[PDB]
Design a protein around this ligand. Sequence first.
Ligand SMILES: O=C(O)C1=C[C@H](O)[C@@H](O)[C@H](O[C@H]2[C@H](OS(=O)(=O)O)[C@@H](NS(=O)(=O)O)[C@@H](O)O[C@@H]2COS(=O)(=O)O)O1
Ligand SMILES: [Ca+2]
Length: 367
Amino acid sequence: ETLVPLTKRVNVQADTARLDQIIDGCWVAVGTNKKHAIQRDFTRLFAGKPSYRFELRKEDNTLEGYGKGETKGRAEFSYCYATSADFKGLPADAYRKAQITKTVYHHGKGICPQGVSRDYEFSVYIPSALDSNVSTIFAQWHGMPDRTLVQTPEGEVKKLTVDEFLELDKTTIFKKNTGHEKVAKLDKQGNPLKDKKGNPVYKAGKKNGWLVEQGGYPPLAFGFSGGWFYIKANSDRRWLTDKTDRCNASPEKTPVMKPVTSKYKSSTIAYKMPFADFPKDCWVTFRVHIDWTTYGKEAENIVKPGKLDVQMEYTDKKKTVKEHIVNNEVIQIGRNDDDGYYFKFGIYRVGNSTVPVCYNLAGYKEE
Ligand SMILES: O=C(O)C1=C[C@H](O)[C@@H](O)[C@H](O[C@H]2[C@H](OS(=O)(=O)O)[C@@H](NS(=O)(=O)O)[C@@H](O)O[C@@H]2COS(=O)(=O)O)O1
Ligand SMILES: [Ca+2]
């Protein structure tokens, strides 16, 4: 039993993790639950401990991307999640409301707050077999949208109470950020569906003009794209993220430390290297220090810029290498939200790609 499937999955925004879903006391898994997607690997040890092998085959995109007809794939670990214990002391109804607002993980461990520096470390192991045209994020620092921040059909941006948001949710259903008239789904015969609880199955009707804050680019991502290893930092100072503003730097095209900018956003390639030069069949360790950009909430200003420092270490061809690949660079990095940031690693296959991805991750620590 050299590879042990870890198939349990948590919707961290909408559900607590049961203790039996927690991996090694500090992780939950998200994305496709195929046996091969995530496995504890006793054949590829790091620091005398099992690593995690991640694998998405061609057919393993189970999610939709932003554009029409686009798909994406996910098999990742999240360091942030809530448990039953996190709701100890709160009113009984707190959890139900957290599920609807998608704020359950707000109550959990693993959040680095707004404007709080933190250090991180992790290691990655890229097999020789990894295709050079993969399109995958293997480690990311993810933001936490304001879940009752909405835009009306008429175009007013406003944050509601939870109770008021629950009222809106009676007639609106949000698919990602986009509001639709809430309706009940029918079977192929035109008869109403009933769920396991005997309730109607709610469905998105036509768009109704409402928006809610949801998704957005990760403040920091490590990945491969177009034959490049890259580190990409994103910033968004708009109180309500505008998802139509596709401000994003290309590893291929964008030169290093030259931000692609919009009115509110910034996307910087902090570092890149040709895929061919990335060490294969060895552990590559990243030490990351982040000073988050700080924002003025409803004022939508950048208060202070951020900073990024990255060291990369490995052993290959009978020499140890240490390179200061991001050398204390002033950078814009973060999001204008109430809550801060959480780490994930694994596979997030983006850029409308189905090129297979398989590699190992281990040795995670934060401050
Ligand atoms: O659609 C884009 O602009 C885009 C292009 C990049 O090739 C891809 O890495 C990037 O993926 C986003 C993702 O968009 S997607 O269309 O859903 O895949 C985005 N989702 S969204 O719902 O907020 O738009 C989020 O998950 O971040 C992905 C990675 O972002 S970045 O690391 O490229 O900045 O989007
Ligand atoms: Ca926001």
